[PDB]
């Protein structure tokens, strides 16, 4: 599950949403989803889940992003899908390359793993691809 505050970009509208707002309002937004080959595609959210308050850990990525998710949340890495709790400094996660062009994914090293924290968590179902970019990182849905 992803923590409250997680930013999700809707490529069809240009709006960046906070996951808790998407779930609380059952907003049918589109997200940046990753296909098996690494290409990105806009896919609609079809299910919304308020997963309650749970423990989450943080992955500070080279570049500035800090992904907060439960230890069992799956993240796309250089070695495929791995649980956030299994990752450590040095491991690389998948991130979309800048949309302005200045092929579509890049792997960034985890700067540091942050200690467990209590937070409201959520989940979304993304049609067909079951993935989405959250806090600048390709994560599992």
Q: Could you give the residue ranges of the DSSP H alpha helices within 9-86? A: 19-24
The Cα-based distances of 45 to 30, 48, 51, 60, 67 in angstroms read 6, 8, 16, 26, 20
Q: Are 84 and 76 in contact (CB under 8 A)?
A: no
- Number of residues in contact with a copy of itself, rule: CB under 8 A? 17
Min CB(125)–Zn ion separation in Å: 5
Cα–Cα distance measured from residue 81 to residue 84, given in angstroms and rounded to the nearest whole number: 9
Cα–Cα distance measured from residue 10 to residue 125, given in angstroms and rounded to the nearest whole number: 14
Selected from 7, 24, 49, 62, the binder of a copy of itself by CB under 8 A is 49
Min CB(12)–Zn ion separation in Å: 19
Selected from 15, 47, 53, 116, the binder of a copy of itself by CB under 8 A is 47
Min CB(41)–Zn ion separation in Å: 15
Region near a copy of itself per CB under 8 A, out of 18-26, 41-49, 91-99, 110-118: 41-49
With binding defined as CB under 5 A, does residue 141 bind Zn ion? yes
Min CB(34)–a copy of itself separation in Å: 11
């Amino acid at each position: 599950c992803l923590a409250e505050g997680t930013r999700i970009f809707d490529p069809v509208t240009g709006t960046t949403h906070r996951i808790e707002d998407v779930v609380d309002g059952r907003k049918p937004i589109h997200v940046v989803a990753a296909a098996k080959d690494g290409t990105l595609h806009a896919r609609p959210v079809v299910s919304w889940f308020d997963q309650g308050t749970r423990d989450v850990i943080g992955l500070r990525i080279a570049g500035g992003a800090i992904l907060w998710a439960t230890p069992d949340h799956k993240v796309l890495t250089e070695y495929g899908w791995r649980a956030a709790g299994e990752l450590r400094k040095g491991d690389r996660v998948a991130q979309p390359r800048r949309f302005d062009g200045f092929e579509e994914l890049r792997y960034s090293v985890i700067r540091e793993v942050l200690p467990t924290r209590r937070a409201r968590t959520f989940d979304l179902e993304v049609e067909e691809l079951h993935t989405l970019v959250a806090e600048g990182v390709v994560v599992h849905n």
